[PDB]
Structure formats: structure tokens, C-alpha cells
């Protein structure tokens, strides 16, 4: 698995709070990052997973943990989605667009048959190291509370080596 | 270029008139087909390049021509789009979603560095042989008026050789 | 990721209830199997992870779920470990020894520079399709309760498609 | 396709207004250039596709656009041709001879099985970046009228971005 | 050299006495053939060489010897040339067009830099065997009388082996 | 065979008298080393081979010989075994853990289909040259005394060239 | 190592009891064989090893063990060697000549820079499986007694799986 | 063909006027050289070709033209042949022996299945550029007079470009 | 060396007593053949080697031995040489022309930088097996008598195995 | 063939006059050398060839020619062979042992399926250039007289270019 590997550089357009920004691997340096991949915007799956994460975003920011949602949709497309479903509107974190699929493949998370990302979550430490990975098949939901638990523990071991 | 080639096989999801269908190379069928590629849904140029084609779509069945718009967004993404712009609401032809980019690359029409299709239009005759090609950079619109041009008598030469 | 792939073949020896047995992919066919990897036996990191899973074993067996713990240690070491830690003594599921590291490499779960497996968990359905993956660096525990959640969830989707 | 690429270097002989010159990629110059490809000289469709372009040539310097017709015949062959058809006599732009087919293949525009160029027209801006492409099978003529189309404001977007 | 090798198959369009025909390698079977390559039609070199051959064409036909002029020009192009210079008008033999260069390269006679054939003459016997080759640089003329001399001698040895 | 070759570099974790150590080829320079391989800790075979070596360890240390027992188990596993067993508690020499098999593989001594080392012993001189190799299938024990003999000889020839 | 492997096929000439014979792998089947390699005949770096083995030879023989000495010399050289030394003269088991080095390479026991075999001993059971290997540098003698031991041990385990 | 290429390097022994000498490409530099290949010495085909060339030797020397006959025979055989046939005795030019066939293979003039040179003639200018090639099957003689014609012709063009 | 190998197939043109013949390996089957190589015809070295062979040819033909002289010249050239020379006019055996060098190259006997054969002689038995090879630099003549001796021996051993 | 080539470098052990020595290519420089290969010592397919060469040895010696016999046996085997046969006992030139077969392969003179050298003789001039080669199958003896002849002939041509 990619556990304990360094994420590789990337440059994508993303959507974060009414504006279009650019995220690259430098921006993740010095920070804790959570990459939340999902297959696609505007799908009939209830977006609860992206929103569930939104709910913990204030505590995540408080812990110095940044968040990035990712789909092979364009960033233009994330916006429409953010401003259309009330649940999706709770997102204040960056919503990265990866239409080239480059980011998704960097994390070896592509459903190569469908051109969409698998439902995977990655926890990356300040050094660019992947410290926790979770991937699930369509229908198996990710509970943001457990992600958070891993994250505090992850942060802890960096600080208390034993 | 692909002028005069037989189109290659494909299976993409698409949206047509309220709910979702499949398109394959055979659905093109013994008909004249128009593949109208465009970069992406929801961007800010309002694209009724697409809408003009829609306006002229009724007249496009004319001849037994199907019109297929194509972008690297998903079909989920195209509908959401048919519902946001009234100008886009005008579309009665198939909006094909090509998330894997395979359809786009079949027509050698991918902006590989962006993961989006280029502004290219293709005219395909009933045995699937491409009879006309037009490609432009963004900002240079395509007129359906004589996109309609001239399918022509492409018609004719094909039914009155020379 | 290995998501949605069918697991590969293996034949390994294991300690399960006081006895040495052999395990193969065939023993998993038709059942839900959970493959729980860990670095090594007799280490000083507490097997709270393994015992927690054992506590829920009564419960995994109800859903028709098999549990296989895996380390690059021998089944012999597993027999020994099962007799020294009271937390480990509780294990009623199979402890697979993968001294050749082949089973571990099957799930691409090897730390090659150490010769030990990563803290990885896999949920495999009766058709041998991996439906869930969870991997963590040491110090970042895997929550057994949450594991159970995913499995029940995995089971629904499987009996009630979308 | 070649949409948006930098043209590759070339040196071909050509005919212009009574006697023979050289064209290289640099003669394109900080100007808008039009490469008008056609199959061959002296065939029997009378081609004033070429002549229309000639008719509209005066207006084509307009903007500082050069017009270059291209076929796999030699420059010797193009002149003989300027002298046989009064309609062809109308041409004041460069008729490039491309016997080696290198110019044609630079624009990926060769009918490899015939050794003739396809009916393709290309618009190149002053730094040599292709901004527009149109290709058709024989029998489907190209209208200079809006070949002139729209060079456009290709002009504009380039001098008024977006 | 290609002396004593069998010519390889080909299919070109050619011009012979007011009409457009097709020549292939089958047509040369059972006959003596002379392939007279030249660089290009409508050049400022005096076409005396093609015409000089015309002068001996009646005797060549009388001896069962066919003739083929060849250039990378199209056959359309040979016509214009045949009906424009009084010297070129003497040709009653086929004037093959090889715009793909395939024939010329079959005889390894291409000026690869210029896309034109070298000034070479080939004598091919009824079995497809090359029996006499002559190639010269621009400006060195081929005297048809000597070609004829070689040809009778060539025909003779086939008949009188010694 | 590997006879008369220089041992290759290695870095392994090990157990030696209650503590974890690192062992590398550099740790062998200038000394006589015995690399004592065995399949695995905690198996059902009685460990007389390891123990027999321990019995002669004192005497080997006088001759300036280091002993490294080696299996593909981890050092963690050696810790456990060293406490749990009878005879192994007698072990005061280094127990090297080779989970990656590189040490074992260095000596061409891996049972690849098993992921375990063969029952093999090697005598290595101060320059890292292997002077004696002994390998046997299970049930055929290695005699520590014969090992010592060979070692004495190895040291002799080495200190008195050409006889 | 070649431990626990089946010997590869061979066809060699040999000196046996005043006579020249052919030996092949088919000739080892069903028997316990000891392949005793040595550098060369007529060295006189001590030929104690060949002679020592000769002394334990019928004890080896009616444990049902055959002994084959092997060097890269010819069988011709072996009879000659057998006729000059009272110690070598004592050898009554087969002395295989391996001029091509094929047997030696079979047991991967060749010193390539010298063109001679190493001081290696191999024990092969009736199934052609190598159960024991002993290799030493020149000067480090091989103990016949320890060989005998190993062979008996090998035979036991082989007839009594689980002790 | 080898037309217009610079000849390759060679060092061969030869018979020239009663003496054995060595010949290299350097001995040709700055001169017009004619390389006359033939199958073999002492054959029964009459060297009328060689003697005819000798008759014109007086004359080749006037134009500053060197003559080198070449066969895969040795210079030794050439000495012998020069003394047996009165027609051959006339040879005052160099008879190069190419026993290794390398010189012959340089001009790609070898009949590989026979180990002999083809009846080939080459005209090389002072800069080492081959300006004329004539090759024939046996029985088809090369005309020396015609050779001379080409050489004079070759010389003009060289002193009066186009 | 090519000693004890089967000659490879060949087809060459040749001169033999005024006529042109083809010679192939098939023409050698069942006979003893001597392939006598030399650099070239018409050179400045006196041809005693070819002539010496001719002198013994009669006698070789009684022993059932065929002689093929070989150079990379053509058969045409051999014709010439056979008439022009002294001693070569004495030649009644086949003079093979090898302009392509395949025969010469068959016997590994080509001076590649010269395009000529080395002064080499080969004795080949009825089964196409080379039994004797002799090669010398210029100035060191090959003695036909010694050739005969060798041939007699070759025939002997061949008709009376194992002495 | 290797005719007219320079010998490749070598370092071998040998038996010489009751003593063991080293011979290398540097030891042939400036002298005429005869490399006399033979299958093996102690065969007794006739050792006439080695003895015959010994008889012509000082005639060879004060033409300034050195003689080196070569077999794939060891030098050890050669002294032994030199002590048993009155005919071999007569050899006073160096007997090179080539256990590795390197010298033999240098002269491309090895019988690979047997591990022994062929009956080949080579003449090397002071510049290390092979001027003469003679190879024969077993049973076809090599004539010492003809060797001597060739050597004198070789030396002449070498000192008198053009005769
Ligand atoms: K996409
Ligand atoms: K292990
Ligand atoms: K052309
Ligand atoms: K010591
Ligand atoms: K040997
Ligand atoms: K030749
Ligand atoms: K006979
Ligand atoms: K030997």
C-alpha cells in the first residue's frame, strides 16, 4: 500500500468559499492534509460523506488539519454542486478538481474503467507522508468521526514517539 | 488528421430528455452523426455554441442526423447543467459524458494537459466514416448555421458521387 | 488501490484454536473474510488491536465473517504468542503465518525494508472481491467497532444493490 | 488534434507572382498565416476553393495574414496551373509546392495512401500557434467567406483576452 | 545494385494517349518494360530526354518493349504537361504518376531530400527481372539510342544463352 | 560453494543478553565469526543445536570467536524465545533477526518456498572470508565440538601459512 | 545451499579396486552415497582425508553407504595415485576422475581460478537427496567420525520421522 | 541509388603498367575517376569491354580522368590476365584487385551468391561525388564511347552549373 | 580446433583436368578427402606445396583419397593457372574455386583482412570427420610425405579401433 | 585458424627438471617456443610423442627453441608421471599443468566433452606469433622430425624475407 510514502507533486484547480484557487503540493507542506476522494458530483448517492466531513471541519482546522475533496469533475463543476444541494453548501474546505485524473492517479485511486476516483481518504502529515488510508466500495460509507480519531492519534505519535 | 476514417467503438453515458441512456458506436447507425465536443460544463463563457446547435437541432434531425455533445464531465454533470442555464435547457440532443476521456481521445480531441476536450465538431456518415472536421481554440465560436453547412450535400456527393 | 479486485491465491499454515491448520483462498470462497495484517508478534506495541477484534469475533461469526490475522511470523510463533498474552489468548480466529511474505505481498501490504506487514485490514466478499481497505502507520490504531460497521454496510449493499 | 500547437519548421518552394521564392517557418513571421491545403493541381473538379480564397485574398492581407496554398505537386507544377485556369490565374497568394510531403505531414494532413494533401485549412497566429482548423473530404468545399470567418477577432481574443 | 532482382509490385495511375489508366505489376508480366524516371514535369530542363525516348517508341513497341515515364507528380499533372510542350506531346507511352513515391522507392530511386526521382532508367525482362540500370546526376543526359542497344542485346541473351 | 569468499554487508536487529543490538559486517571486522542458521524459533524441534553452541560459547569467546544465531524471525521473536525456553535461556551470544531474509540470502541459505533458513553453519575469518561451511537437513544435528575443531584448524592454518 | 536437493545426472570414469569403471547417477539410486571431493591427487597437502575415509569404509559399507572420491584428475591419475602411496593404496571405494569438472560443478564445488574441486563432502540418500554438506578451506581437515555420525543420524531420521 | 553520394574509403592493391601499386580513395581525390567493375578475370566472356575502355584511355587521361578496373580477383591474377589476352595487354590504367570484396561492396556492387562484382560503371568527380552509374547483366555490354559522352557531359555541368 | 568435427556443406565450382565440375559435401561421402588450402593462384611464391601434393597424388588415389586444392580465386582463374604453370600443369586433382569464401570460412581458414585462405591442410574421413589439420605461415611449406603418413595412420586407427 | 596470431597471456605451474616452476607468456618472449599438447598423463595411448620430442630436445635447444608440454593434469601429476616411465623420465623440458584449461582454451585446443586437450603442437616465434599448427586425432601420431623441419623453415623465412 502507499502507507508511509510521500505524496507526489500536483497542481490542480480547486474551489474554496465562493472563489477559484490553485492547490499544489507546496501548499500541503508544513500542514496536515486530508484528501477526500469521491467518484463524482451530482450523483444520486446522497453526498452525506462530503458533508459529514464539513461538520468536523471546524475542529479539523483547529487541529491544523486541512481538507481537500477530489473528483475528476472540473472545479467549475464543484461550484455548481456546492451551490445546489444544501448538504454540499456546508463545505468551507477546498474542493479540488482533477479532470486530468493526475491527482487521483498520484494516489493510485483511479477506477480506470470509469474515469472516477475510488471512495478513498488519505491522511498526510506535515512532511508529505501518508499516515492513514481508507478505501471503500460504492455504498460503504466513511464515518468522519473515525477519521478524526485516527488523525488525533496520528498527530499524537508524531509528538510522542513511543 | 482523422478526415475519412471509420470511427472507433465507444460506450458512454449520456443524457437525453429527462433520463439516462447509453450510446455505442452502433447507435450512430446508418445515420449522419454530429459529435460536438466542448471543453467543460458550467464554465463561464456561456457556451450556447451548444445552444445554437440545439436551436438548429430540430432541423438537424432533418436528414436523419443525430447530434451528440461531448465533454469530459459526467452525464450526471451534464443534466445539472441542462437545468441551470435556460439557454442550455434548449438542448434536445444527447449530451454525452466522457469522464474517462476515451471518446474524446478516439477523435484525437483531448487537451491532454487539462483533461478536457477541445472545441471540435465532427460529422459522421451512416457507415461511421468522418466526412468533416472543425476545431478551434476557446474564444473562437462554432456556428451551427454552417455546421449545418454543409452536411450539405455531404448527403449528395454520397448519393450523387462527384 | 486493490479495491474491487479479487484476492489472489495463497496456501499458508496457521494457528486457530490450539491447532495448526492450513489456509487457502478456497477456504474463503463463499464467505465473508476479513484479513487483518499486523507488523509482528511479540512486539512491544500492545495487540489491543488484535484482542479488540477477538472481542467482536463472537459477533463477526454471526454475519458469516471469517477472521484471519496475518504477520510474517510463523504459525509456530503465533502458537507461542497466543499462549503468552492474555489479550492474544482470546483469539479464536485463525492466525496465519506468512514467513515467505507472499500472502502479505499479495495484498501489496509489505514493508519491504523491514520484512513485515503494514497495519492493514481488508474486507473480502464471498466472490473474493475486496470491498474495504484500511491501512495505518504504527500508533494509529484500527477501530474494531468501525470495522464491524463497514462489514454490515458491506453486506447490505450486497443484498440490496443501490 | 493540432489545435493550439506551435507549427513545426519548414522550407518549401513556392510560387508568387511571376517567379519563385522560398518559404520557411520564419516568413510566417509575427503575422497571421493561412495554410490552405488541397489535394492536387490540375485535377478535374475545378477547385476555385482556392480561387475564392484568392478573391478574398486582398481582404486577407487585411490583418496582416498571408495565404499559403499547399499541395504535394511541385512549384513548377503550381505555376503551370496558374496559367491554365483563368479562375486559378486569380491567385495572388503563395502556392507552396510540397513534393516531399513534409509540410503536409507537419500539419498531420497527408492522405498517406495517395501522396496528396487533404482538404484542410489552418489559421496560424503571429508566434506560429494554430488557432483554427477545418478539414473535409473531396466534394465538400471550403468557403473563404468564413474561412475569413472568423479569423475573427482571433485577432481580438488575442488582443482582448476573454 | 538492383541488377538481376525482380521488380516489386506496384499500382499507380498513369496517363497514356488522352486517357487515365492504371498500371500495376501484373501489366508488366510477360512483357519487356522500360521505366524511365525523371525528377519532375514542368521543369526548366528541356524535356528532350522523355521526347528522345518517344522517338524510339515505335521501334520499342515493335520489339515488344513497353515504356513508362515516372515522376512523383500526379497523372493529372503529366497530362497538362503532355498537352503543353510540343516535345512532351510526342509521348504515346504510359506516363506514370507516383505521388506517394511508392514506385520510385521500389526501385530505390528517390532523392529523399527533394521528393523527386533520380534520372534513372531500368530495363525489366518478361519475368520481372531488372537487366540494365542507368542513373545520372542532373544535367547528364541519357541517350535513348544506347538504351535501345542494350535492350536488343538484353533480348538477345535471353534467346541465345552463351 | 561460498567457501573462500568474503561475506556480504548486512544490517540486522538482534537479541543479545536482554538487549537489542544492530549487527553489521563492520561488527565482524577483525574477528572470527560463526553465523549459525536455523529454520525458526518456537518450532517443535528440540533446540539442542543452539544450546550445544551455547555450551561451547565461553570457550569460543576465549578463542576470540563471535556467534550469531540466525533465523528469519524478528529480534522481537528471539526475545520471546530466549525467555520461554529451557536451553535457549542459556544463550548469551547474538540472536539476529532476519525478517527480510537478506542475511540468509547473503549466504545462499534460504528455503524460498518456506521463507526460512536451512540448518547451516559458517566460519568466517577476521577478513570476512568463509573458511568452513556446514549444512544439514532436519534431524541431522550439528555438533558444536566438531565446529570448534574446525575453528581451531581454521585459526591455525591462518596463523601458520603453508602446511 | 544444495541442501535437501536431488543430485543431477552424471557419467564419469573411475578407479575401482585395481579396475576402471563407469559411474552414473543411476548407480547411486537406492543407496546412501558419500561424495568426497578433494583438490587433486599427488598434492601431498595431507592425503589423510582420503585414507581416513578408507579406514571407516566398511563400517560405512554395512550401514549400506557407498563412497565416491572425486577430484578433477583423470581416473588414470587416480590408479597411479593409488599405486604410489600406502595410504592411498588403502582406498578400496571408487575414485572418480572428473577432468571436465561436470560432477564438481554439479555439486557447485569447483574453485574456478584453480581448476580443482574444494574439500567438500556430500551425503546422498537412496532418493538422491542431499542431506548433508561439509565444505572446508585447505588446512581445515574433515572428520570421518563426524561424517559417520551424520550418516547414521541421517538414516535414522529418514526411517523414523518425528524424533 | 548511390547517385550523388561521396564514395567510401578503400585501400587495395593493383596492377598498373607492369607494377603492383596500392590504391586508396585519396589517390582519387581531386580527379575524375571511373570505376569499372567486372565479374572475373580469365573468364570466357570476352573483355571487349575492358579493351574498348583502354582504346579510349589515351582519351580519358585527357579530361583528367583516372580509370580503375575492379574484380574480386587478386592483383596477381590481374598481372597474369594482362599478359595473356592481347586485348587486356592494352590496359594502361589500374586493375584493382578486391579479393575481400570490400571495394566492390562499397559501391553495393556485389553478387553475393557468386563472390563477384556486377558489370557496373561509376563516374566520380574530384569531390568524390558519384555523378553516373551504369549496371548490366552479362551479355549486355557497356559502351565505352557512350561512357565518354557522359563524362564530358559530367564535366560541363560541373563547370557551368545549370 | 575443428579436429573431430563433421565438415559443413558446400557447393563450389572447380577445375579438374581440363573440365569444370561442381563439388559438394555429398561428393565427399564415403571417401577420404584432403582439403588443401593456399592463399592464391599466380602469386610470387613458387607452388611446390601444390606440386608436391600432385607428386603423391597417384599414390593417394590408391589409398582412396581425394584431393581438393582451394583458394578464393575462381575456377576460371584455376584454369588459367593450370596452364600457365610449370608444376601446376602437373595437377590432376580438383581445384576448387571459392570466390565467396564459404568453403574457406567453413574451415575457419580465412584471412579476413586479405580475403584469402591461410596455408592450411585438412584430412577428412568417409563420414566427414576431420582427423588431422595442419596450418603454416608463408615460407613454412607443407610436406606431402608427412601428409601421407598421417593419412595412413588415420586410415589405420579407423580400420582397427583402440590401440 | 590461430595461424599468424600472437599468443594470449598465461600463468601456469609446471614441472621442470625435478622442480616446480611458473611459466608465463613473458617467459616465451624472445624465444622460439613449441607448445606440445596431449590428452593426459598416465594414459598409455602411446607416450611416444612426449618422449620423441624429448629426444630431439637439445637439437631444438640450440636452434634456440623451448619446449612446453601441456595437458590438463596438474603439475603434480606431471612430476609423478615423470617418475614412473623411463620414457617420460627422459623429459627435461617443462611439463605445464593446465587444470583450469585456460592455456588449452587459449590455443582453442580443448575437447570440451572430455576435459582434455587435443594432440596439438604449436610453434611460436620470439614475437609470440604462431607460425605453425599441427593437430591430430588420437592414433595419428605427430612426427618430431617434421616439427624440427618446420621450425628451421620458420626461422629461415623469418630471417630471410623473400626466399
Ligand atoms: K472528468
Ligand atoms: K519472518
Ligand atoms: K509529389
Ligand atoms: K585468536
Ligand atoms: K585436472
Ligand atoms: K576472390
Ligand atoms: K582405403
Ligand atoms: K585433468
Residue B134 falls in which region: left (phi positive, over 0), alpha (psi -120 to 50) or beta: beta
Selected for mutation to probe chain I from J3, J39, J43 (highest I CB count within 10 Å) is: J3
Q: Which ligand is nearest to the CA of B75?
A: 1
Helix-then-strand count for chain A, H and E: 5, 9
Residues of E in contact with H120 (CB under 8 A): 1, 3
In chain H, count H helices and then E strands.
Answer: 6, 9
Choice among E3, E45, E46, E89 that is catalytic: E46
Of G135, G138, G150, the CB nearest to F140: G150
Strand partners, G134: F134, G121
Question: Which residue in C9, C29, C45, C46 is the catalytic one?
Answer: C46
Are F77 and C102 inside 8 Å of each other by CB?
Answer: no
Among candidate residues F115, F110, F124, the one with its CA nearest the CA of residue F23: F124
- Is the Cβ pair E133, H137 closer than 8 Å? no
Tell me the C-alpha distance between I155 and G41, whole Å. 37
- Give chain A positions within 8 Å (CB) of B114: 99-100
Q: How many other CB atoms are there within 10 angstroms of residue H127's CB atom?
A: 10
Contact: chain F with chain G (3+ CB pairs below 8 Å): yes
Smallest CA–CA distance from I119 into chain J, residue: J3
**Interfacial residues of A (vs C; Cβ cutoff 8 Å):** 1, 3-4, 108-109, 111, 118, 120, 129, 131-141, 143, 146, 149-150, 153-154, 156-157
Per DSSP, J135 falls in state: E
Among residues J10, J28, J25, the alpha carbon closest in space to that of J99 is found at J10
Q: Cell for B39?
A: 471543453
Per the listing, cell 447543467 goes with B81
F65: distance to nearest CA of chain C, Å? Answer: 28
What is the SS3 assignment for G56-115? CHHHHHCCCEEEEEEECCCHHHHHHHHHHCHHHHCCCCEEEECCCCHHHHHCCCEECCCC
CA of I152 to the centre of ligand 7 (A): 9
Instruction: Give exposure, G40-67, as e/b (b: 16+ Cβ within 10 Å).
Output: bbbeeeebebbbbbbebbeebeeeebbb
Q: How far apart are CA C36 and CA C142, in angstroms?
A: 10
Spell out which chain H residues touch chain E, with contact meaning CB-CB distance below 8 angstroms: 1, 3-4, 108-109, 111, 118-120, 129, 131-141, 143, 146, 149-150, 153-154, 156-157, 162
Give the experimental resolution in Å: 3.3
With both helix axes pointing from N to C terminus, report the angle between G48-55 and G144-159 in degrees, rounded to the nearest 10.
50
Residue extents of the structural domains in chain B: 1-162
The CA dihedral of G109, G112, G116, G122, to the nearest 10 degrees, is 0
Verify whether the Cβ–Cβ distance F99 to C114 is below 8 Å. yes
Which residue has 605453425 as its cell numbers? J132
Which grid coordinates are listed for E89?
A: 506531346
What residues of chain I lie within 8 A of the CB of H81, using their CB? 80
Instruction: Give the Cβ contact number of residue E113 at 10 Å.
Output: 8
Three cell numbers written together for A149? 480519531
Rounded Cα distance between D117 and D109, Å, is 6
Give the orientation angle of helix A144-159 with respect to helix A48-62, to 10 degrees.
Answer: 30
Question: What is the I148 CA–ligand 6 centroid distance (Å)?
Answer: 30
User: Exposure of J102 by Cβ count < 10 A (0-12 exposed, 13-18 middle, 19+ buried)?
Assistant: middle
Grid cell listed for G120: 567438500
Report the C-alpha gap between H69 and H38 in whole angstroms.
8
Q: Among C51, G73, C18, I137, which Cα is nearest to J72's?
A: G73
- Experimental approach was X-ray
Angle formed at CA C81 by CA F18 and CA C111, multiple of 5 degrees = 80
The helix/strand/coil state of E74 is coil
Written as one string, the DSSP assignment of chain C is: --TT-BPPP-EEEEEETTEEEEEEGGGTTTSEEEEEE-S-TT-SS-THHHHHHHHTHHHHHHTTEEEEEEESS-HHHHHHHHHH-HHHHT--SEEEE-TT-HHHHHTT-EETTTTEE-EEEEEE-TTSBEEEEEEE-TTSPPPHHHHHHHHHHHHHHHHS--
Interface test with A, best of C119, C128, C134 (most A CBs within 10 A): C134
Q: How many CB atoms are located within 10 Å of the residue E9 CB?
A: 12
Of J112, J115, J82, J78, nearest to J97 by C-alpha is J78
Q: Measured between alpha carbons, how far is C144 from C126 in angstroms, rounded to an integer?
A: 21
Interfacial residues of I (vs H; Cβ cutoff 8 Å): 40-44, 72-74, 76-77, 79-81, 84, 98-101, 112-116
For C1-162, CATH gives: 3.40.30.10
Q: Which residues pair with F35 in a beta bridge?
A: F68, F122
Residue E118: name the closest of D60, H5, J81 by CA.
Answer: H5
Distance from B18 to chain D by nearest Cα, in Å?
A: 33
Cα separation of G78 and B62, whole Å?
102
Give the span between the Cα atoms of C23 and C97, in whole angstroms.
Answer: 10
Distance in Å, alpha carbon of E65 to nearest chain D alpha carbon: 29
For J77, the closest of G41, G112, G113 (CB atoms) is G41
Any chains having at least 3 CB pairs less than 8 A from chain E are D, H
Angle (deg, nearest 10), helices G75-84 and J75-84? 60
| CB-based contact A109 C1, cutoff 8 Å | yes
**Calpha distance I47→I54 (Å, rounded):** 11
Which residue among I74, I84, I112 places its CB closest to the CB of H80? I84
CB of B11 within 8 A of CB of D11? no
Element (H, E) at H156: helix H144-159
CB atoms closer than 10 angstroms to residue E10: 19
Q: Which residue of C has its CA nearest to F101?
A: C115
The fold for domain I1-163 equals Glutaredoxin (3.40.30)
Task: Spell out which residues of chain I touch residue H70, defining contact as CB-CB under 8 Å.
Answer: none
Residue that the C-alpha cell 513548377 belongs to: D76
Query: What Rg do the C-alpha atoms of chain H give, in angstroms?
Result: 15
Q: How many CB pairs below 8 A link A and B?
A: 71
Q: Which residues contact D117 (CB under 8 A, 6 or more apart)?
A: D37, D38, D39, D70, D71, D72, D98, D101, D104, D109, D110, D111
Do D25 and D5 form a contact (C-beta atoms < 8 A)? no
Instruction: Please tell me the distance from the alpha carbon of residue J99 to that of residue G39, in angstroms, as a whole number.
Output: 10
Q: Which residues of B are catalytic?
A: 46
Beta bridge partners of G70: G37, G96
Backbone angles phi, psi at J74, to 5 degrees: -85, 170
Please say whether the dihedral angle defined by the alpha carbons of residues B145, B147, B150 and B155, taken in this order, is positive or negative.
negative
**In B5-160, alpha helices (H):** 49-55, 57-61, 75-84, 102-106, 154-159
- Measured between CA atoms, the residue of chain F closest to residue G161 is F139
Q: Which of H60, H28, H46 has its CA nearest to residue H144?
A: H60
The backbone region for F68, taken as left when phi is positive above 0, alpha when psi lies in -120 to 50, beta otherwise, is beta
CA-based nearest residue in chain A for residue B84:
A80
- Angstrom distance (rounded) from CA C103 to CA B79: 46
| F118/G4 CB distance under 8 A | yes
Q: List residues, by chain if needed, whose CB lies under 5 Å from ion ligand 5.
A: G 72-73; J 99
Q: Do chains H and F touch (3 or more CB pairs under 8 A)?
A: no
> If you count them, how many residues does chain F have?
163
d(CA G40, CA H67): 69
Q: Answer for the pair G75, G96: CB distance below 8 angstroms, yes or no.
A: yes
CA distances from C150 to A3, C123, C134, D161, F10 (A): 20, 9, 11, 51, 43
Question: What is the C-alpha separation between G125 and G139, in angstroms, rounded?
Answer: 28
> Which residues does residue E19 pair with via DSSP β-bridges, in sequence order?
E16
Interface test with chain D among B105, B125, B135, by most D beta carbons within 10 Å:
B135
Residue C144 CA from chain centroid, whole number: 12
Nearest to D115 among E40, E42, E99 (CB): E99
H/E run at residue D124: strand D119-124
Contacts of G156 in chain F (CB under 8 A): 139
B42 and B115 Cβ atoms separated by less than 8 Å:
no
Q: Which of J46, J89, J153, J157 is catalytic?
A: J46
Residue of H nearest to E44 (CA): H162
Place of cell 512483357: E31
Catalytic residue among G19, G24, G26, G46: G46
User: Which residues in chain B have Cβ-Cβ distances shorter than 8 Å to D146?
Assistant: 143, 146
Name subunits touching J (3+ CB pairs < 8 A): G, I
Ligand nearest to the CA of E97: 3
Which three three-digit cell numbers place residue B127? 457507415
Comparing alpha-carbon positions, the chain A residue that sits nearest to B116 is A99
Amino acid at each position: 500500500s502507499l502507507i508511509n510514502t510521500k505524496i507526489k507533486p500536483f497542481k490542480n484547480q480547486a474551489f474554496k468559499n465562493g472563489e477559484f484557487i490553485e492547490v499544489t503540493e507546496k501548499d500541503t507542506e508544513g500542514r496536515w492534509s486530508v484528501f477526500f476522494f469521491y467518484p463524482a458530483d451530482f450523483t444520486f448517492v446522497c453526498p452525506t460523506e462530503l458533508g459529514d466531513v464539513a461538520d468536523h471541519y471546524e475542529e479539523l482546522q483547529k487541529l491544523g488539519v486541512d481538507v481537500y475533496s477530489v473528483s475528476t469533475d472540473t472545479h467549475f463543476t464543484h461550484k455548481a454542486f456546492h451551490s445546489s444541494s444544501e448538504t454540499i453548501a456546508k463545505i468551507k474546505y477546498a474542493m479540488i478538481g482533477d479532470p486530468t485524473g493526475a491527482l487521483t492517479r498520484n494516489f493510485d485511486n483511479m477506477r480506470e474503467d470509469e474515469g472516477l476516483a475510488d471512495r478513498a481518504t488519505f491522511v498526510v502529515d506535515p512532511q508529505g507522508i501518508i499516515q492513514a488510508i481508507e478505501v471503500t466500495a460504492e455504498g460503504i460509507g466513511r464515518d468522519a468521526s473515525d477519521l478524526l480519531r485516527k488523525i488525533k492519534a496520528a498527530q499524537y505519535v508524531a509528538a510522542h514517539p513511543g
